[PDB]
Write a protein that binds this ligand. Structure first.
Ligand SMILES: Cc1ncc(C[n+]2csc(CCOP(=O)(O)OP(=O)(O)O)c2C)c(N)n1
Ligand SMILES: [Mg+2]
Length: 524
């Protein structure tokens, strides 16, 4: 058996059947003789390849396999990998290297010091010392990606390795199963349970790791039993709780003072699957007010170490959520009251307020719709106005890198064919990974793309204000025709210059057999 044959057998055996890629010289000996049980998903730029794999991985809650071309291909995907690091996305990033005999002279397409390139974004990076080590290197890649805390890994393979004889001993890798489904020991778990049972005014904060583990339901049961209000942690890359549930308090503001104020009065704050905290704006103050103690459950040692306050437990979010939900007592406390219904804003028959767009989407979209956000100035309004009852219903770039949602929406739609994906993307954001559209068209992945066209980098103008930053150049993006871009890449394009045009376009897009892009003329 060749290294080619053995690697594809290992991928097969580890449950991988999809290659997200953009091909190159160095990848031809990998991609040739492409097995019938695999599918190749081509994107036109490596940001878009990784974005699609990333969405695919997060929705399927399984590793996604990527093949890129050397330094240039790997480099083009670096922004995407930044998002993948923070989302703990299980991505196997493979890249072809020049033939072993030509690495020394640095022939064209040589990836120099290959393993250092993706650092520090990946959890593991590697170039095998020999062709016969490639399957073992791939096994390490798979498990390093899949073990908590999950994350992107990188493997560089000299193109001449694939044709070589594999080690017959490589067969022991095929069915390797590694488990990170661990929870705190009974003694320390009973202590934690007894502290939640005893809390006067408990508060729960959930991060993306809850949605990643599908711990949503256990957290709902946990919140019901403790009769406790629930927030999603700041800069939320995913939605870990039903947003119209009585306990839900919404998106936490990404500020130090703001969060301590919010938690004031809460004796015990339980944070699950979230960094403590992903602060964004400089909001100096106390991390916690007196009388509030914090306990953080995280699957990431880095997040436990980084926390400027509270106690931490490093464990599987799924296993811990299940354990806590089934062990805590029913509080005699009354269930928190559901948040108020959002206000309908004044809307004329002209350019649309973001609020109008989100109200419209909530009325018209299927109850199991999946949303992606890269409309950077409208995130707060989106969280308030979209009723997301089910797991895996929301995705935002984890590291805030733009160019995620458009590709990611295609990967989510591919993973969830029976759930309508609707990506709400700003006019600025749409450009970073615009070429991703071609993939939806070519593979007939029926993602709906809603472009919020305000002519500007809205969020930067708003932040310019907060920073008192005047005469900043490059904040406006006029003269972009998103329907012409969609047509450029074979995607049906509709326009919505007003509410009746929005209602029409959406009903059309919801009944379309293919991807549809709606260009929405939004205010400001
Ligand atoms: C790769 C990358 N480049 C730049 C930024 C900085 N950035 C943050 S928000 C933003 C503006 C996005 O504009 P748009 O999608 O039109 O949404 P709006 O702010 O108008 O709602 C930019 C450029 C980033 N986060 N990532
Ligand atoms: Mg904009």
């Amino acid at each position: 058996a060749s290294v080619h044959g053995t690697t594809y057998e290992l991928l097969r055996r580890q449950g991988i059947d999809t290659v997200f890629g953009n091909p190159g010289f160095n990848e031809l000996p990998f991609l040739k003789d492409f097995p019938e049980d695999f599918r190749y998903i081509l994107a036109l730029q490596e940001a878009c390849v990784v974005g699609i794999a990333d969405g695919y991985a997060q929705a399927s809650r399984k590793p996604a396999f990527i093949n890129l071309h050397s330094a240039a291909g790997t480099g083009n995907a670096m922004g995407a990998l930044s998002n993948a690091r923070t989302s703990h996305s299980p991505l196997i990033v493979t890249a072809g290297q020049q033939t072993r005999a030509m690495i020394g002279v640095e022939a064209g397409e040589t990836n120099v010091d290959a393993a250092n390139l993706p650092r520090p974004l990946v959890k593991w990076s590697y170039e095998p010392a020999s062709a016969a080590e490639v399957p073992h290197a791939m096994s390490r890649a798979i498990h390093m990606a899949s073990m908590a805390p999950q994350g992107p890994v990188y493997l560089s393979v000299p193109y001449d390795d694939w044709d070589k004889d594999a080690d017959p001993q490589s067969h022991h890798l095929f069915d390797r199963h590694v488990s990170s489904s661990v929870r705190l020991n009974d003694q320390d778990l009973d202590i934690l349970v007894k502290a939640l049972n005893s809390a006067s005014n408990p508060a729960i904060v959930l991060g993306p790791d809850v949605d990643a583990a599908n711990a949503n339901a256990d957290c709902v049961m946990l919140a019901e039993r403790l009769k406790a209000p629930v927030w999603v942690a700041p800069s939320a890359p995913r939605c870990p709780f039903p947003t119209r549930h009585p306990c839900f308090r919404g998106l936490m503001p990404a500020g130090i003072a703001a969060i301590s104020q919010l938690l004031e009065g809460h004796d015990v704050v339980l944070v699950i699957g979230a960094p403590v905290f992903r602060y964004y704006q400089y909001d100096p103050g106390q991390y916690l007010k007196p009388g509030t103690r914090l306990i953080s459950v995280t699957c990431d040692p880095l997040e436990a170490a980084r926390a400027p306050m509270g106690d931490a437990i490093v464990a599987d979010i799924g296993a811990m959520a299940s354990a806590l939900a089934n062990l805590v007592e029913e509080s005699s406390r009354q269930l928190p009251t559901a948040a108020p219904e959002p206000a309908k804003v004044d809307q004329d028959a002209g350019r649309l307020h973001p609020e109008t767009v989100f109200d419209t989407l909530n009325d018209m979209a299927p109850e199991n719709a999946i949303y992606l956000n890269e409309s950077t100035s409208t995130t707060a309004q989106m969280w308030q106005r979209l009723n997301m009852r089910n797991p895996g219903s929301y995705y935002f770039c984890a590291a805030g890198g733009l160019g995620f949602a458009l590709p990611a929406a295609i990967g989510v739609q591919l993973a969830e064919p029976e759930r309508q994906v609707i990506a709400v993307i700003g006019d600025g954001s749409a450009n970073y990974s615009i070429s991703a559209l071609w993939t939806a068209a070519q593979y007939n992945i029926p993602t709906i793309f809603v472009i919020m066209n305000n002519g500007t980098y809205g969020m930067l103008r708003r932040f310019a204000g907060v920073l008192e930053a005047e005469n900043v150049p490059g904040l406006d993006v006029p003269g972009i025709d998103f329907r012409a871009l969609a047509k450029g890449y074979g995607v049906q394009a509709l326009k919505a210059d007003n509410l009746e045009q929005l209602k029409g376009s959406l009903q059309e897009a919801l009944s379309a057999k293919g991807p549809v892009l709606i260009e929405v003329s939004t205010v400001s």
